[PDB]
């Protein structure tokens, strides 16, 4: 799995290959590769690791489970429209916004954007 990290804080987007389905989440692959995404909790409630996820290969989209904690934190930041919630509940499709500490790496190429700010502007 290829990941492309992009941010205004980083002069250049970083490309790096990741192992899909590791118990360590995208938070781990961010830490091992010298990319800093603000992290402020170990229980997945702060929401400071909110990021934009884009799957460049639209055909290769992998189903996943949107857990209730991630759902509620996305509601707490507000980055969860009703239609995205319904789509994730029915078709098991990922939403555009994710949390770096709760998103699992899937076998595809992904682009992750962040502003360096905690979730919620």
């Amino acid at each position: 799995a290829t990941i492309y990290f992009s941010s205004p804080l980083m002069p250049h987007n970083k490309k790096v290959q990741a192992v899909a389905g590791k118990r360590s989440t995208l938070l781990g692959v961010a830490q091992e590769n010298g990319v800093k995404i603000p992290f402020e909790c170990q229980d997945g409630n702060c929401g400071s690791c909110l990021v934009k996820i884009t799957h460049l290969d639209g055909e290769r989209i992998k189903g996943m489970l949107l857990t209730d904690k991630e759902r509620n934190v996305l509601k707490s930041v507000g980055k969860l429209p009703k239609s995205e919630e319904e789509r994730a509940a029915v078709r098991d499709l990922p939403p555009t916004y994710r949390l770096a500490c709760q998103t699992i790496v899937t076998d595809e190429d992904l682009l992750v954007e962040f502003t360096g700010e905690p979730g919620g502007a």
Partner: protein, 274 residues
């Protein structure tokens, strides 16, 4: 059904003046809503008579999630007319400090606590920095009317300017408008006509000038409002007059943000700073 918000620097009597305004609004047959976004949950202390109202997010986290949260567990009506809700805030350094407002207001519309019995809904938002949840009521157009609490201190004027910039930025999104300026008084000279002049250059009106009085501290020890403590107190009549001008205020304008140098010029011409 009008929605209002107190914006301003902390410690300028936002919670106290707001709560006394609520006490004044309760008696003339009006049912009103109060929620405070201040991270310290002291915005509903005087009405509810509780030592500290259990805020939304604390008992949402203890109950696992906000879905397992009941409206009755947070919607406490210390007085018959008015109900009281506290948004709360996270631990310092844990995420954005304004998402508590997000969750509180979202849950409030989800359970429909705004139904068929509301005359005024009034929020107490920290106006030191408008960002995230603090800037939110400007953004989704939830609060139609905004009132700014200020004093003669320069940081109060700068905070009011930041509020003006924020509302100007989001004027086209909705009917968010500045209904006027209310200024509490510290024991310093040449104050009321100052804030009047700030309103004059802001394009807005000055609502009322509330002074510093002794009865407020006694009410603080009592944990009941001045109007509930001493209805004959001149400060109680002052709060009643303030409330009746809020109800009878008609003009809602788009403010004009003011630069640093002109603010400084007013400050030196009044001599508040050298």
């Amino acid at each position: 059904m009008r929605q209002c918000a107190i914006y301003g620097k902390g410690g300028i009597g936002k919670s106290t003046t707001t709560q006394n305004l609520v006490a004044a609004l309760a008696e003339m047959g009006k049912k009103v809503m109060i929620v405070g976004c201040d991270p310290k949950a002291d915005s509903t202390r005087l009405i509810l008579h509780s030592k500290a109202q259990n805020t939304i997010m604390e008992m949402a986290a203890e109950a696992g999630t906000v879905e397992d949260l009941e409206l009755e567990d947070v919607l406490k009506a210390g007085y018959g007319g008015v109900k009281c809700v506290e948004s709360g805030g996270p631990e310092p350094g844990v995420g954005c400090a304004g998402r508590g407002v997000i969750t509180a207001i979202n849950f409030l519309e989800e359970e429909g606590a705004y139904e068929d019995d509301l005359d005024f809904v009034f929020y107490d938002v920290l106006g030191d920095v408008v960002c995230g949840g603090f800037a939110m009521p400007i953004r989704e157009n939830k609060a139609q009317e905004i009132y700014i609490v200020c004093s003669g201190e320069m940081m109060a004027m700068y905070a009011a300017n930041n509020i003006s910039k924020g509302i100007v930025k989001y004027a086209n999104s909705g009917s968010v408008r500045l209904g006027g300026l209310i200024c509490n008084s510290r024991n310093t000279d040449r104050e009321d006509e100052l804030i009047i002049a700030l309103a004059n250059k802001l394009g807005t009106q000055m609502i009322h000038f509330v002074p510093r009085d002794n009865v407020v501290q006694r009410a603080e020890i009592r944990r009941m409002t001045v109007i509930e403590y001493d209805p004959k107190a001149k400060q109680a009549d002052e709060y009643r007059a303030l409330a009746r001008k809020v109800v009878d205020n008609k003009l809602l304008v788009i403010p004009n943000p003011i630069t640093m140098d002109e603010l400084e010029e007013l400050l030196m011409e009044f001599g508040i700073m050298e």
